[PDB]
Each structure stands twice: as structure tokens, then as C-alpha cells.
């Protein structure tokens, strides 16, 4: 009697599951040869695997039975079993949870105040805004504007740093009200979020 053995690739590499992949999905087929044509049975082995697998036993289908969530777990070791009924054969395999674009930009050091004199010049960094977005590549990636956009104040693209734009009047205007939009950069679906930026003028 020789023991079967695994032919998938992902015994030697790595198996990606998408983390909007829906529960009860089939994410693959184990496939397993024996030498002697011996029936084969597919088993999942460990705790956190058969919480996350069920392997139907007599095809090597893998189900998803959790959802996952690549910024809680991202990655994780799992143990598949193959039988001919005399011996038992494990192979490991790495499972890397693929990420979506699944997050919106979440704003930090709220609320954002600042109070300026009307002296102020042009040109003259005022604030620091901050968002970041827990999303891999492009959707983890954001940048600032106003919504909708300002005369007096612009904010920079990438470092989200508030300048004035024109000079400033204490006697038209003693506060302004601006909208912060922070977008991830997504090419398919890009998720925005907006923050409130209050300005106090002094004199
Ligand atoms: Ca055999
Ligand atoms: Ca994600
Ligand atoms: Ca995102
Ligand atoms: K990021
Ligand atoms: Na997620």
C-alpha cells in the first residue's frame, strides 16, 4: 500500500480567499491521487480550521462556514487530512484573506476648531486634518477636499493642511463652516467620509 498525496498548488504556495467571499462559498477542491487507485476521504483538521472549513469527504469541496475580515484576521494556517483507509496524510496550507475596499476613511483629534487672527496672510498653514483608511493599495489610500469648495481656505490633497487662500475681514465674516471630504482611491468603488473643520476669526 502507498499513501495518497495532494496535487493542488496551494500545498506548496498559498490559497487567496477574497474576504467578501459569502459564507457557505465553495473556495476549492481538494484533488488527491493514490498509486494503488485506493477510494479517498478529505478531512479538515484543527479547531480554528473546522470552525472556518467543512471539507465534504468523499469530493475534497472546501466551504466557507464564517465570514472573514482581512483587518481582523489576514492571514491564517489550516490543516487538510486525505485517507485511503489504511494511512492518513495532513498537508498545511497558508490562507491569505484577499482585501476589498470595505473601509471609509475614519477621522482622528475630533473636533477640528481652530480660531486665526483676520491678519492671517495668504499662503499661511492654519490646521492639520487626519484620516486613514485600513484598506489595501488604491482603497487604502485618500485624499482631502472641501465640499463643497472654498474662496478662503484651500487644503492640500495628500497632507490634508488647511491654508489660507484670500485675505480674511473680521467685519463681513467671524467664522466659517467648511466640510473636510477624505476619499480612499478606489477605482471601481471609492468610499468617502466628511468631517466638520470649524474657523473662528479674532482681531
Ligand atoms: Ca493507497
Ligand atoms: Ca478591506
Ligand atoms: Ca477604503
Ligand atoms: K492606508
Ligand atoms: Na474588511
Same mark, same amino acid.
Do not use: E, K, M, W
Given at each position: 500500500? +502507498?499513501?495518497?498525496?495532494?496535487?493542488?498548488?496551494?500545498?506548496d504556495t498559498?490559497?487567496?480567499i477574497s474576504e467578501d467571499t459569502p459564507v457557505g462559498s465553495s473556495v476549492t477542491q481538494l484533488l488527491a491521487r493514490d498509486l494503488d487507485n485506493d477510494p479517498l476521504v478529505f478531512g479538515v483538521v484543527g479547531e480554528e480550521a473546522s +470552525?472556518?472549513?467543512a471539507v465534504e469527504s468523499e469530493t475534497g469541496v472546501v466551504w466557507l462556514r464564517q465570514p472573514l475580515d482581512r483587518e481582523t484576521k489576514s492571514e491564517f494556517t489550516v490543516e487538510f487530512s486525505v485517507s485511503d483507509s489504511q494511512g492518513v496524510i495532513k498537508g498545511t496550507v497558508?490562507?491569505?484573506?484577499?482585501?476589498?475596499?470595505?473601509?471609509?476613511? +475614519?477621522?482622528?483629534?475630533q473636533p477640528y476648531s481652530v480660531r486665526i487672527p483676520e491678519?492671517?496672510?495668504?499662503?499661511?498653514?492654519?490646521?492639520?486634518?487626519?484620516?486613514?483608511?485600513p484598506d489595501q493599495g488604491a482603497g487604502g489610500s485618500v485624499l482631502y477636499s472641501f465640499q463643497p469648495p472654498?474662496?478662503?481656505?484651500?487644503?492640500d490633497?495628500? +497632507?490634508?493642511i488647511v491654508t489660507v487662500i484670500r485675505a480674511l475681514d473680521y467685519e463681513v465674516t467671524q467664522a466659517y463652516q467648511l466640510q473636510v471630504n477624505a476619499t480612499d482611491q478606489d477605482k471601481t468603488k471609492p468610499l468617502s467620509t466628511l468631517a466638520n473643520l470649524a474657523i473662528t476669526i479674532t482681531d
Open positions: 500500500n +502507498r499513501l495518497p498525496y495532494f496535487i493542488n498548488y496551494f500545498f498559498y490559497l487567496l +470552525r472556518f472549513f497558508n490562507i491569505q484573506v484577499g482585501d476589498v475596499n470595505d473601509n471609509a476613511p +475614519r477621522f482622528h483629534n491678519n492671517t496672510p495668504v499662503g499661511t498653514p492654519i490646521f492639520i486634518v487626519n484620516a486613514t483608511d472654498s474662496n478662503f481656505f484651500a487644503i490633497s495628500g +497632507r490634508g
